PDB file of N, CA, C and O in Angstrom:
ATOM      1  N   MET A   1      62.337  25.346  -8.373  1.00  0.00           N
ATOM      2  CA  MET A   1      61.181  25.349  -7.433  1.00  0.00           C
ATOM      3  C   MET A   1      59.948  24.766  -8.107  1.00  0.00           C
ATOM      4  O   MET A   1      59.068  25.499  -8.552  1.00  0.00           O
ATOM      5  N   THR A   2      59.889  23.440  -8.170  1.00  0.00           N
ATOM      6  CA  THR A   2      58.788  22.763  -8.833  1.00  0.00           C
ATOM      7  C   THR A   2      57.499  22.904  -8.030  1.00  0.00           C
ATOM      8  O   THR A   2      57.501  23.258  -6.849  1.00  0.00           O
ATOM      9  N   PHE A   3      56.379  22.626  -8.700  1.00  0.00           N
ATOM     10  CA  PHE A   3      55.091  22.608  -8.018  1.00  0.00           C
ATOM     11  C   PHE A   3      54.964  21.406  -7.096  1.00  0.00           C
ATOM     12  O   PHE A   3      54.242  21.471  -6.096  1.00  0.00           O
ATOM     13  N   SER A   4      55.645  20.303  -7.415  1.00  0.00           N
ATOM     14  CA  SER A   4      55.504  19.090  -6.617  1.00  0.00           C
ATOM     15  C   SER A   4      55.994  19.291  -5.190  1.00  0.00           C
ATOM     16  O   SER A   4      55.556  18.581  -4.279  1.00  0.00           O
ATOM     17  N   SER A   5      56.904  20.243  -4.975  1.00  0.00           N
ATOM     18  CA  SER A   5      57.336  20.556  -3.618  1.00  0.00           C
ATOM     19  C   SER A   5      56.182  21.099  -2.786  1.00  0.00           C
ATOM     20  O   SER A   5      56.035  20.747  -1.611  1.00  0.00           O
ATOM     21  N   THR A   6      55.353  21.956  -3.379  1.00  0.00           N
ATOM     22  CA  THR A   6      54.219  22.558  -2.691  1.00  0.00           C
ATOM     23  C   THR A   6      52.935  21.751  -2.830  1.00  0.00           C
ATOM     24  O   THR A   6      51.890  22.198  -2.349  1.00  0.00           O
ATOM     25  N   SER A   7      52.977  20.586  -3.480  1.00  0.00           N
ATOM     26  CA  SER A   7      51.756  19.813  -3.682  1.00  0.00           C
ATOM     27  C   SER A   7      51.204  19.272  -2.370  1.00  0.00           C
ATOM     28  O   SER A   7      49.984  19.161  -2.215  1.00  0.00           O
ATOM     29  N   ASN A   8      52.076  18.927  -1.422  1.00  0.00           N
ATOM     30  CA  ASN A   8      51.605  18.376  -0.156  1.00  0.00           C
ATOM     31  C   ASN A   8      50.861  19.415   0.671  1.00  0.00           C
ATOM     32  O   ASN A   8      49.893  19.079   1.361  1.00  0.00           O
ATOM     33  N   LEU A   9      51.293  20.674   0.616  1.00  0.00           N
ATOM     34  CA  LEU A   9      50.708  21.739   1.430  1.00  0.00           C
ATOM     35  C   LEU A   9      49.376  22.165   0.812  1.00  0.00           C
ATOM     36  O   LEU A   9      49.237  23.223   0.196  1.00  0.00           O
ATOM     37  N   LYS A  10      48.371  21.307   1.003  1.00  0.00           N
ATOM     38  CA  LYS A  10      47.071  21.524   0.380  1.00  0.00           C
ATOM     39  C   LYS A  10      46.390  22.790   0.876  1.00  0.00           C
ATOM     40  O   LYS A  10      45.520  23.321   0.178  1.00  0.00           O
ATOM     41  N   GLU A  11      46.755  23.280   2.063  1.00  0.00           N
ATOM     42  CA  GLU A  11      46.119  24.479   2.594  1.00  0.00           C
ATOM     43  C   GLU A  11      46.379  25.684   1.701  1.00  0.00           C
ATOM     44  O   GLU A  11      45.537  26.583   1.608  1.00  0.00           O
ATOM     45  N   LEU A  12      47.538  25.719   1.041  1.00  0.00           N
ATOM     46  CA  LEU A  12      47.857  26.825   0.144  1.00  0.00           C
ATOM     47  C   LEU A  12      47.082  26.720  -1.163  1.00  0.00           C
ATOM     48  O   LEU A  12      46.599  27.728  -1.689  1.00  0.00           O
ATOM     49  N   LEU A  13      46.954  25.511  -1.697  1.00  0.00           N
ATOM     50  CA  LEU A  13      46.379  25.320  -3.019  1.00  0.00           C
ATOM     51  C   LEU A  13      44.868  25.501  -2.984  1.00  0.00           C
ATOM     52  O   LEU A  13      44.207  25.220  -1.981  1.00  0.00           O
ATOM     53  N   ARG A  14      44.320  25.971  -4.100  1.00  0.00           N
ATOM     54  CA  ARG A  14      42.876  26.104  -4.217  1.00  0.00           C
ATOM     55  C   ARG A  14      42.218  24.733  -4.168  1.00  0.00           C
ATOM     56  O   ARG A  14      42.707  23.770  -4.763  1.00  0.00           O
ATOM     57  N   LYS A  15      41.101  24.652  -3.452  1.00  0.00           N
ATOM     58  CA  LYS A  15      40.311  23.434  -3.334  1.00  0.00           C
ATOM     59  C   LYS A  15      39.029  23.612  -4.131  1.00  0.00           C
ATOM     60  O   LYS A  15      38.248  24.530  -3.859  1.00  0.00           O
ATOM     61  N   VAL A  16      38.820  22.738  -5.112  1.00  0.00           N
ATOM     62  CA  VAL A  16      37.599  22.703  -5.906  1.00  0.00           C
ATOM     63  C   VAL A  16      37.070  21.281  -5.857  1.00  0.00           C
ATOM     64  O   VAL A  16      37.778  20.339  -6.232  1.00  0.00           O
ATOM     65  N   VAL A  17      35.836  21.125  -5.397  1.00  0.00           N
ATOM     66  CA  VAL A  17      35.252  19.804  -5.212  1.00  0.00           C
ATOM     67  C   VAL A  17      34.656  19.328  -6.529  1.00  0.00           C
ATOM     68  O   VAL A  17      33.984  20.085  -7.240  1.00  0.00           O
ATOM     69  N   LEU A  18      34.913  18.066  -6.863  1.00  0.00           N
ATOM     70  CA  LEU A  18      34.364  17.475  -8.074  1.00  0.00           C
ATOM     71  C   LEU A  18      32.881  17.205  -7.874  1.00  0.00           C
ATOM     72  O   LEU A  18      32.502  16.136  -7.386  1.00  0.00           O
ATOM     73  N   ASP A  19      32.043  18.175  -8.235  1.00  0.00           N
ATOM     74  CA  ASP A  19      30.609  18.047  -8.024  1.00  0.00           C
ATOM     75  C   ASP A  19      30.061  16.856  -8.795  1.00  0.00           C
ATOM     76  O   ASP A  19      30.397  16.640  -9.962  1.00  0.00           O
ATOM     77  N   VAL A  20      29.212  16.074  -8.130  1.00  0.00           N
ATOM     78  CA  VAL A  20      28.733  14.815  -8.684  1.00  0.00           C
ATOM     79  C   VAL A  20      27.436  14.452  -7.980  1.00  0.00           C
ATOM     80  O   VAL A  20      27.125  14.975  -6.911  1.00  0.00           O
ATOM     81  N   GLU A  21      26.672  13.549  -8.589  1.00  0.00           N
ATOM     82  CA  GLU A  21      25.415  13.093  -8.009  1.00  0.00           C
ATOM     83  C   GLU A  21      25.704  12.101  -6.890  1.00  0.00           C
ATOM     84  O   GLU A  21      26.352  11.074  -7.116  1.00  0.00           O
ATOM     85  N   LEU A  22      25.222  12.409  -5.689  1.00  0.00           N
ATOM     86  CA  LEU A  22      25.367  11.545  -4.528  1.00  0.00           C
ATOM     87  C   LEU A  22      24.038  11.463  -3.797  1.00  0.00           C
ATOM     88  O   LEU A  22      23.191  12.354  -3.901  1.00  0.00           O
ATOM     89  N   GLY A  23      23.872  10.373  -3.052  1.00  0.00           N
ATOM     90  CA  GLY A  23      22.683  10.158  -2.254  1.00  0.00           C
ATOM     91  C   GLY A  23      22.155   8.749  -2.385  1.00  0.00           C
ATOM     92  O   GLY A  23      22.920   7.811  -2.630  1.00  0.00           O
ATOM     93  N   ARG A  24      20.845   8.591  -2.222  1.00  0.00           N
ATOM     94  CA  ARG A  24      20.208   7.290  -2.320  1.00  0.00           C
ATOM     95  C   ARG A  24      18.814   7.473  -2.896  1.00  0.00           C
ATOM     96  O   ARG A  24      18.182   8.516  -2.712  1.00  0.00           O
ATOM     97  N   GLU A  25      18.346   6.447  -3.597  1.00  0.00           N
ATOM     98  CA  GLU A  25      17.070   6.535  -4.292  1.00  0.00           C
ATOM     99  C   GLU A  25      15.915   6.593  -3.301  1.00  0.00           C
ATOM    100  O   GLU A  25      15.922   5.919  -2.269  1.00  0.00           O
ATOM    101  N   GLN A  26      14.921   7.416  -3.619  1.00  0.00           N
ATOM    102  CA  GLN A  26      13.703   7.452  -2.826  1.00  0.00           C
ATOM    103  C   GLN A  26      12.937   6.149  -3.001  1.00  0.00           C
ATOM    104  O   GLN A  26      12.920   5.566  -4.088  1.00  0.00           O
ATOM    105  N   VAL A  27      12.304   5.692  -1.925  1.00  0.00           N
ATOM    106  CA  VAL A  27      11.528   4.458  -1.930  1.00  0.00           C
ATOM    107  C   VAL A  27      10.062   4.820  -2.106  1.00  0.00           C
ATOM    108  O   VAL A  27       9.485   5.534  -1.277  1.00  0.00           O
ATOM    109  N   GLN A  28       9.461   4.323  -3.180  1.00  0.00           N
ATOM    110  CA  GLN A  28       8.061   4.566  -3.484  1.00  0.00           C
ATOM    111  C   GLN A  28       7.193   3.469  -2.879  1.00  0.00           C
ATOM    112  O   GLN A  28       7.653   2.357  -2.612  1.00  0.00           O
ATOM    113  N   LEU A  29       5.919   3.797  -2.668  1.00  0.00           N
ATOM    114  CA  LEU A  29       4.931   2.850  -2.162  1.00  0.00           C
ATOM    115  C   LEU A  29       4.169   2.276  -3.351  1.00  0.00           C
ATOM    116  O   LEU A  29       3.361   2.972  -3.973  1.00  0.00           O
ATOM    117  N   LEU A  30       4.421   1.004  -3.657  1.00  0.00           N
ATOM    118  CA  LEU A  30       3.849   0.357  -4.829  1.00  0.00           C
ATOM    119  C   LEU A  30       2.582  -0.434  -4.535  1.00  0.00           C
ATOM    120  O   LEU A  30       1.799  -0.680  -5.457  1.00  0.00           O
ATOM    121  N   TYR A  31       2.363  -0.835  -3.284  1.00  0.00           N
ATOM    122  CA  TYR A  31       1.310  -1.795  -2.973  1.00  0.00           C
ATOM    123  C   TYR A  31      -0.090  -1.202  -3.049  1.00  0.00           C
ATOM    124  O   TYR A  31      -1.053  -1.962  -3.185  1.00  0.00           O
ATOM    125  N   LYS A  32      -0.226   0.119  -2.955  1.00  0.00           N
ATOM    126  CA  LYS A  32      -1.532   0.715  -2.679  1.00  0.00           C
ATOM    127  C   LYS A  32      -2.607   0.397  -3.712  1.00  0.00           C
ATOM    128  O   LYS A  32      -3.755   0.158  -3.302  1.00  0.00           O
ATOM    129  N   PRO A  33      -2.341   0.396  -5.021  1.00  0.00           N
ATOM    130  CA  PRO A  33      -3.391  -0.015  -5.968  1.00  0.00           C
ATOM    131  C   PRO A  33      -3.911  -1.423  -5.739  1.00  0.00           C
ATOM    132  O   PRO A  33      -5.069  -1.703  -6.069  1.00  0.00           O
ATOM    133  N   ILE A  34      -3.095  -2.318  -5.183  1.00  0.00           N
ATOM    134  CA  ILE A  34      -3.544  -3.686  -4.953  1.00  0.00           C
ATOM    135  C   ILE A  34      -4.379  -3.789  -3.683  1.00  0.00           C
ATOM    136  O   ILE A  34      -5.277  -4.633  -3.599  1.00  0.00           O
ATOM    137  N   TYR A  35      -4.112  -2.947  -2.688  1.00  0.00           N
ATOM    138  CA  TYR A  35      -4.618  -3.131  -1.336  1.00  0.00           C
ATOM    139  C   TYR A  35      -5.719  -2.135  -1.005  1.00  0.00           C
ATOM    140  O   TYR A  35      -5.630  -0.954  -1.352  1.00  0.00           O
ATOM    141  N   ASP A  36      -6.753  -2.630  -0.331  1.00  0.00           N
ATOM    142  CA  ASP A  36      -7.801  -1.794   0.236  1.00  0.00           C
ATOM    143  C   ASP A  36      -7.434  -1.474   1.679  1.00  0.00           C
ATOM    144  O   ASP A  36      -7.297  -2.383   2.504  1.00  0.00           O
ATOM    145  N   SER A  37      -7.276  -0.191   1.984  1.00  0.00           N
ATOM    146  CA  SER A  37      -6.768   0.238   3.280  1.00  0.00           C
ATOM    147  C   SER A  37      -7.924   0.481   4.239  1.00  0.00           C
ATOM    148  O   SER A  37      -8.821   1.280   3.949  1.00  0.00           O
ATOM    149  N   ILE A  38      -7.899  -0.210   5.377  1.00  0.00           N
ATOM    150  CA  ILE A  38      -8.812   0.033   6.487  1.00  0.00           C
ATOM    151  C   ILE A  38      -7.976   0.430   7.694  1.00  0.00           C
ATOM    152  O   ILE A  38      -7.000  -0.250   8.030  1.00  0.00           O
ATOM    153  N   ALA A  39      -8.339   1.547   8.320  1.00  0.00           N
ATOM    154  CA  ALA A  39      -7.572   2.135   9.411  1.00  0.00           C
ATOM    155  C   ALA A  39      -8.478   2.298  10.620  1.00  0.00           C
ATOM    156  O   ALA A  39      -9.499   2.989  10.548  1.00  0.00           O
ATOM    157  N   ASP A  40      -8.099   1.665  11.725  1.00  0.00           N
ATOM    158  CA  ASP A  40      -8.805   1.815  12.991  1.00  0.00           C
ATOM    159  C   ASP A  40      -7.794   1.587  14.098  1.00  0.00           C
ATOM    160  O   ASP A  40      -7.134   0.546  14.125  1.00  0.00           O
ATOM    161  N   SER A  41      -7.669   2.557  15.003  1.00  0.00           N
ATOM    162  CA  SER A  41      -6.660   2.465  16.049  1.00  0.00           C
ATOM    163  C   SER A  41      -6.902   1.299  16.996  1.00  0.00           C
ATOM    164  O   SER A  41      -5.950   0.823  17.623  1.00  0.00           O
ATOM    165  N   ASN A  42      -8.140   0.821  17.107  1.00  0.00           N
ATOM    166  CA  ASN A  42      -8.504  -0.195  18.081  1.00  0.00           C
ATOM    167  C   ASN A  42      -8.478  -1.605  17.497  1.00  0.00           C
ATOM    168  O   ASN A  42      -9.136  -2.502  18.030  1.00  0.00           O
ATOM    169  N   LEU A  43      -7.730  -1.822  16.424  1.00  0.00           N
ATOM    170  CA  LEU A  43      -7.661  -3.151  15.831  1.00  0.00           C
ATOM    171  C   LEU A  43      -7.076  -4.213  16.760  1.00  0.00           C
ATOM    172  O   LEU A  43      -5.972  -4.028  17.291  1.00  0.00           O
TER     173      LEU A  43
ATOM    174  N   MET B   1       2.563  -5.121  30.817  1.00  0.00           N
ATOM    175  CA  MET B   1       3.777  -5.994  30.872  1.00  0.00           C
ATOM    176  C   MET B   1       3.758  -7.391  30.219  1.00  0.00           C
ATOM    177  O   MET B   1       4.794  -7.862  29.748  1.00  0.00           O
ATOM    178  N   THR B   2       2.593  -8.040  30.177  1.00  0.00           N
ATOM    179  CA  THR B   2       2.494  -9.453  29.825  1.00  0.00           C
ATOM    180  C   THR B   2       1.321  -9.682  28.880  1.00  0.00           C
ATOM    181  O   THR B   2       0.464 -10.531  29.127  1.00  0.00           O
ATOM    182  N   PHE B   3       1.247  -8.906  27.791  1.00  0.00           N
ATOM    183  CA  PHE B   3       0.132  -9.077  26.861  1.00  0.00           C
ATOM    184  C   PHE B   3       0.066 -10.493  26.307  1.00  0.00           C
ATOM    185  O   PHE B   3      -1.026 -10.994  26.019  1.00  0.00           O
ATOM    186  N   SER B   4       1.209 -11.160  26.165  1.00  0.00           N
ATOM    187  CA  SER B   4       1.184 -12.572  25.817  1.00  0.00           C
ATOM    188  C   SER B   4       0.510 -13.413  26.895  1.00  0.00           C
ATOM    189  O   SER B   4       0.025 -14.509  26.596  1.00  0.00           O
ATOM    190  N   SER B   5       0.469 -12.929  28.140  1.00  0.00           N
ATOM    191  CA  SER B   5      -0.253 -13.632  29.194  1.00  0.00           C
ATOM    192  C   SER B   5      -1.758 -13.410  29.108  1.00  0.00           C
ATOM    193  O   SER B   5      -2.529 -14.305  29.470  1.00  0.00           O
ATOM    194  N   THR B   6      -2.193 -12.236  28.651  1.00  0.00           N
ATOM    195  CA  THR B   6      -3.609 -11.954  28.450  1.00  0.00           C
ATOM    196  C   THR B   6      -4.097 -12.300  27.051  1.00  0.00           C
ATOM    197  O   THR B   6      -5.296 -12.172  26.786  1.00  0.00           O
ATOM    198  N   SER B   7      -3.209 -12.726  26.151  1.00  0.00           N
ATOM    199  CA  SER B   7      -3.620 -12.984  24.777  1.00  0.00           C
ATOM    200  C   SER B   7      -4.575 -14.165  24.684  1.00  0.00           C
ATOM    201  O   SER B   7      -5.460 -14.176  23.822  1.00  0.00           O
ATOM    202  N   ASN B   8      -4.415 -15.166  25.552  1.00  0.00           N
ATOM    203  CA  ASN B   8      -5.299 -16.325  25.507  1.00  0.00           C
ATOM    204  C   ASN B   8      -6.718 -15.969  25.927  1.00  0.00           C
ATOM    205  O   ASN B   8      -7.675 -16.599  25.464  1.00  0.00           O
ATOM    206  N   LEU B   9      -6.878 -14.973  26.796  1.00  0.00           N
ATOM    207  CA  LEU B   9      -8.197 -14.548  27.259  1.00  0.00           C
ATOM    208  C   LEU B   9      -8.846 -13.728  26.149  1.00  0.00           C
ATOM    209  O   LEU B   9      -8.817 -12.496  26.134  1.00  0.00           O
ATOM    210  N   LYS B  10      -9.447 -14.442  25.196  1.00  0.00           N
ATOM    211  CA  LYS B  10     -10.014 -13.778  24.028  1.00  0.00           C
ATOM    212  C   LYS B  10     -11.209 -12.907  24.389  1.00  0.00           C
ATOM    213  O   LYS B  10     -11.495 -11.934  23.684  1.00  0.00           O
ATOM    214  N   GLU B  11     -11.920 -13.232  25.469  1.00  0.00           N
ATOM    215  CA  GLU B  11     -13.131 -12.487  25.791  1.00  0.00           C
ATOM    216  C   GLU B  11     -12.834 -11.089  26.313  1.00  0.00           C
ATOM    217  O   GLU B  11     -13.729 -10.238  26.300  1.00  0.00           O
ATOM    218  N   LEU B  12     -11.611 -10.831  26.777  1.00  0.00           N
ATOM    219  CA  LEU B  12     -11.240  -9.479  27.176  1.00  0.00           C
ATOM    220  C   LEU B  12     -10.972  -8.583  25.976  1.00  0.00           C
ATOM    221  O   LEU B  12     -11.212  -7.374  26.045  1.00  0.00           O
ATOM    222  N   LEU B  13     -10.485  -9.151  24.879  1.00  0.00           N
ATOM    223  CA  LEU B  13     -10.061  -8.362  23.736  1.00  0.00           C
ATOM    224  C   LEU B  13     -11.265  -7.905  22.922  1.00  0.00           C
ATOM    225  O   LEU B  13     -12.352  -8.483  22.989  1.00  0.00           O
ATOM    226  N   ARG B  14     -11.059  -6.848  22.143  1.00  0.00           N
ATOM    227  CA  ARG B  14     -12.113  -6.353  21.270  1.00  0.00           C
ATOM    228  C   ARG B  14     -12.357  -7.331  20.130  1.00  0.00           C
ATOM    229  O   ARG B  14     -11.423  -7.925  19.586  1.00  0.00           O
ATOM    230  N   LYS B  15     -13.628  -7.494  19.771  1.00  0.00           N
ATOM    231  CA  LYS B  15     -14.040  -8.309  18.633  1.00  0.00           C
ATOM    232  C   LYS B  15     -14.345  -7.365  17.478  1.00  0.00           C
ATOM    233  O   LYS B  15     -15.388  -6.707  17.461  1.00  0.00           O
ATOM    234  N   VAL B  16     -13.429  -7.299  16.516  1.00  0.00           N
ATOM    235  CA  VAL B  16     -13.601  -6.514  15.299  1.00  0.00           C
ATOM    236  C   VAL B  16     -13.658  -7.493  14.139  1.00  0.00           C
ATOM    237  O   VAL B  16     -12.714  -8.263  13.921  1.00  0.00           O
ATOM    238  N   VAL B  17     -14.757  -7.464  13.404  1.00  0.00           N
ATOM    239  CA  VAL B  17     -14.992  -8.418  12.329  1.00  0.00           C
ATOM    240  C   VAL B  17     -14.268  -7.950  11.077  1.00  0.00           C
ATOM    241  O   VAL B  17     -14.311  -6.768  10.719  1.00  0.00           O
ATOM    242  N   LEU B  18     -13.594  -8.880  10.408  1.00  0.00           N
ATOM    243  CA  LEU B  18     -12.939  -8.592   9.139  1.00  0.00           C
ATOM    244  C   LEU B  18     -13.991  -8.627   8.040  1.00  0.00           C
ATOM    245  O   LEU B  18     -14.461  -9.701   7.656  1.00  0.00           O
ATOM    246  N   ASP B  19     -14.362  -7.455   7.533  1.00  0.00           N
ATOM    247  CA  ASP B  19     -15.405  -7.373   6.519  1.00  0.00           C
ATOM    248  C   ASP B  19     -14.923  -8.014   5.226  1.00  0.00           C
ATOM    249  O   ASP B  19     -13.943  -7.562   4.627  1.00  0.00           O
ATOM    250  N   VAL B  20     -15.614  -9.067   4.800  1.00  0.00           N
ATOM    251  CA  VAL B  20     -15.295  -9.793   3.578  1.00  0.00           C
ATOM    252  C   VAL B  20     -16.607 -10.108   2.876  1.00  0.00           C
ATOM    253  O   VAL B  20     -17.623 -10.363   3.529  1.00  0.00           O
ATOM    254  N   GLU B  21     -16.589 -10.077   1.546  1.00  0.00           N
ATOM    255  CA  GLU B  21     -17.806 -10.273   0.764  1.00  0.00           C
ATOM    256  C   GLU B  21     -18.302 -11.703   0.932  1.00  0.00           C
ATOM    257  O   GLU B  21     -17.680 -12.646   0.435  1.00  0.00           O
ATOM    258  N   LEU B  22     -19.425 -11.859   1.630  1.00  0.00           N
ATOM    259  CA  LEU B  22     -20.087 -13.139   1.827  1.00  0.00           C
ATOM    260  C   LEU B  22     -21.464 -13.092   1.183  1.00  0.00           C
ATOM    261  O   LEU B  22     -22.064 -12.023   1.043  1.00  0.00           O
ATOM    262  N   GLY B  23     -21.953 -14.259   0.795  1.00  0.00           N
ATOM    263  CA  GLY B  23     -23.277 -14.409   0.235  1.00  0.00           C
ATOM    264  C   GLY B  23     -23.235 -14.714  -1.253  1.00  0.00           C
ATOM    265  O   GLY B  23     -22.281 -14.390  -1.965  1.00  0.00           O
ATOM    266  N   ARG B  24     -24.304 -15.349  -1.720  1.00  0.00           N
ATOM    267  CA  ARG B  24     -24.400 -15.744  -3.114  1.00  0.00           C
ATOM    268  C   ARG B  24     -24.481 -14.515  -4.013  1.00  0.00           C
ATOM    269  O   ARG B  24     -24.966 -13.454  -3.614  1.00  0.00           O
ATOM    270  N   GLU B  25     -23.985 -14.668  -5.235  1.00  0.00           N
ATOM    271  CA  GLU B  25     -23.919 -13.561  -6.176  1.00  0.00           C
ATOM    272  C   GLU B  25     -25.300 -13.246  -6.738  1.00  0.00           C
ATOM    273  O   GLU B  25     -26.172 -14.114  -6.827  1.00  0.00           O
ATOM    274  N   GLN B  26     -25.489 -11.989  -7.124  1.00  0.00           N
ATOM    275  CA  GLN B  26     -26.767 -11.557  -7.670  1.00  0.00           C
ATOM    276  C   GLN B  26     -27.026 -12.215  -9.020  1.00  0.00           C
ATOM    277  O   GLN B  26     -26.100 -12.542  -9.765  1.00  0.00           O
ATOM    278  N   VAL B  27     -28.308 -12.402  -9.331  1.00  0.00           N
ATOM    279  CA  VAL B  27     -28.754 -13.060 -10.555  1.00  0.00           C
ATOM    280  C   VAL B  27     -29.371 -12.014 -11.472  1.00  0.00           C
ATOM    281  O   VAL B  27     -30.157 -11.171 -11.023  1.00  0.00           O
ATOM    282  N   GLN B  28     -29.011 -12.071 -12.749  1.00  0.00           N
ATOM    283  CA  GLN B  28     -29.551 -11.203 -13.783  1.00  0.00           C
ATOM    284  C   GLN B  28     -30.568 -11.963 -14.624  1.00  0.00           C
ATOM    285  O   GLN B  28     -30.548 -13.193 -14.702  1.00  0.00           O
ATOM    286  N   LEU B  29     -31.463 -11.209 -15.260  1.00  0.00           N
ATOM    287  CA  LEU B  29     -32.446 -11.771 -16.186  1.00  0.00           C
ATOM    288  C   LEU B  29     -31.865 -11.672 -17.589  1.00  0.00           C
ATOM    289  O   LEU B  29     -31.949 -10.628 -18.238  1.00  0.00           O
ATOM    290  N   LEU B  30     -31.274 -12.768 -18.058  1.00  0.00           N
ATOM    291  CA  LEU B  30     -30.580 -12.768 -19.337  1.00  0.00           C
ATOM    292  C   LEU B  30     -31.499 -13.065 -20.513  1.00  0.00           C
ATOM    293  O   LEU B  30     -31.163 -12.710 -21.645  1.00  0.00           O
ATOM    294  N   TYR B  31     -32.648 -13.696 -20.272  1.00  0.00           N
ATOM    295  CA  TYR B  31     -33.487 -14.192 -21.357  1.00  0.00           C
ATOM    296  C   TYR B  31     -34.145 -13.085 -22.171  1.00  0.00           C
ATOM    297  O   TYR B  31     -34.658 -13.370 -23.257  1.00  0.00           O
ATOM    298  N   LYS B  32     -34.160 -11.848 -21.674  1.00  0.00           N
ATOM    299  CA  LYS B  32     -35.056 -10.835 -22.229  1.00  0.00           C
ATOM    300  C   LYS B  32     -34.845 -10.540 -23.713  1.00  0.00           C
ATOM    301  O   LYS B  32     -35.854 -10.383 -24.422  1.00  0.00           O
ATOM    302  N   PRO B  33     -33.624 -10.431 -24.245  1.00  0.00           N
ATOM    303  CA  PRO B  33     -33.491 -10.224 -25.697  1.00  0.00           C
ATOM    304  C   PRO B  33     -34.019 -11.374 -26.536  1.00  0.00           C
ATOM    305  O   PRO B  33     -34.331 -11.164 -27.713  1.00  0.00           O
ATOM    306  N   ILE B  34     -34.131 -12.581 -25.973  1.00  0.00           N
ATOM    307  CA  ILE B  34     -34.540 -13.757 -26.739  1.00  0.00           C
ATOM    308  C   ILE B  34     -36.054 -13.961 -26.734  1.00  0.00           C
ATOM    309  O   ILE B  34     -36.554 -14.821 -27.473  1.00  0.00           O
ATOM    310  N   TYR B  35     -36.811 -13.169 -25.973  1.00  0.00           N
ATOM    311  CA  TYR B  35     -38.229 -13.428 -25.766  1.00  0.00           C
ATOM    312  C   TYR B  35     -39.059 -12.181 -26.017  1.00  0.00           C
ATOM    313  O   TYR B  35     -38.598 -11.053 -25.834  1.00  0.00           O
ATOM    314  N   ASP B  36     -40.295 -12.416 -26.453  1.00  0.00           N
ATOM    315  CA  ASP B  36     -41.295 -11.376 -26.646  1.00  0.00           C
ATOM    316  C   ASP B  36     -42.266 -11.433 -25.477  1.00  0.00           C
ATOM    317  O   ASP B  36     -42.881 -12.475 -25.227  1.00  0.00           O
ATOM    318  N   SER B  37     -42.411 -10.315 -24.774  1.00  0.00           N
ATOM    319  CA  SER B  37     -43.147 -10.267 -23.519  1.00  0.00           C
ATOM    320  C   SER B  37     -44.554  -9.743 -23.765  1.00  0.00           C
ATOM    321  O   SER B  37     -44.727  -8.616 -24.241  1.00  0.00           O
ATOM    322  N   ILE B  38     -45.550 -10.564 -23.444  1.00  0.00           N
ATOM    323  CA  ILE B  38     -46.945 -10.148 -23.369  1.00  0.00           C
ATOM    324  C   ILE B  38     -47.417 -10.421 -21.949  1.00  0.00           C
ATOM    325  O   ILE B  38     -47.266 -11.540 -21.446  1.00  0.00           O
ATOM    326  N   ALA B  39     -47.963  -9.396 -21.302  1.00  0.00           N
ATOM    327  CA  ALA B  39     -48.189  -9.389 -19.859  1.00  0.00           C
ATOM    328  C   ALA B  39     -49.639  -9.064 -19.541  1.00  0.00           C
ATOM    329  O   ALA B  39     -49.944  -8.229 -18.687  1.00  0.00           O
ATOM    330  N   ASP B  40     -50.562  -9.730 -20.227  1.00  0.00           N
ATOM    331  CA  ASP B  40     -51.979  -9.573 -19.935  1.00  0.00           C
ATOM    332  C   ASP B  40     -52.316 -10.371 -18.684  1.00  0.00           C
ATOM    333  O   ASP B  40     -52.122 -11.590 -18.647  1.00  0.00           O
ATOM    334  N   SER B  41     -52.823  -9.682 -17.661  1.00  0.00           N
ATOM    335  CA  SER B  41     -53.113 -10.331 -16.389  1.00  0.00           C
ATOM    336  C   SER B  41     -54.214 -11.375 -16.498  1.00  0.00           C
ATOM    337  O   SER B  41     -54.274 -12.279 -15.659  1.00  0.00           O
ATOM    338  N   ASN B  42     -55.087 -11.271 -17.502  1.00  0.00           N
ATOM    339  CA  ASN B  42     -56.217 -12.176 -17.672  1.00  0.00           C
ATOM    340  C   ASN B  42     -55.924 -13.283 -18.677  1.00  0.00           C
ATOM    341  O   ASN B  42     -56.824 -13.720 -19.400  1.00  0.00           O
ATOM    342  N   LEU B  43     -54.681 -13.741 -18.746  1.00  0.00           N
ATOM    343  CA  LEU B  43     -54.346 -14.793 -19.689  1.00  0.00           C
ATOM    344  C   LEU B  43     -55.055 -16.090 -19.291  1.00  0.00           C
ATOM    345  O   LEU B  43     -55.165 -16.389 -18.100  1.00  0.00           O
TER     346      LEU B  43
END
């Protein structure tokens, strides 16, 4: 009674997730030191 | 509906001036370290 017989039945076996870094890099605002900001809704 | 139709009518739109530095630059008095100042009004 090898383990390979029961390898397919994943519901029986313990599940442990390989924890790892996932996601996407945050986007920073770089332009602001160069630019003078003027804000008016009626432009 | 048709802002591209009213876009040519510039007189309907708001006139907001783009503030930009205009005018000749200020002048400094550079000669002062090189000169001795006597300021008698009755010269």
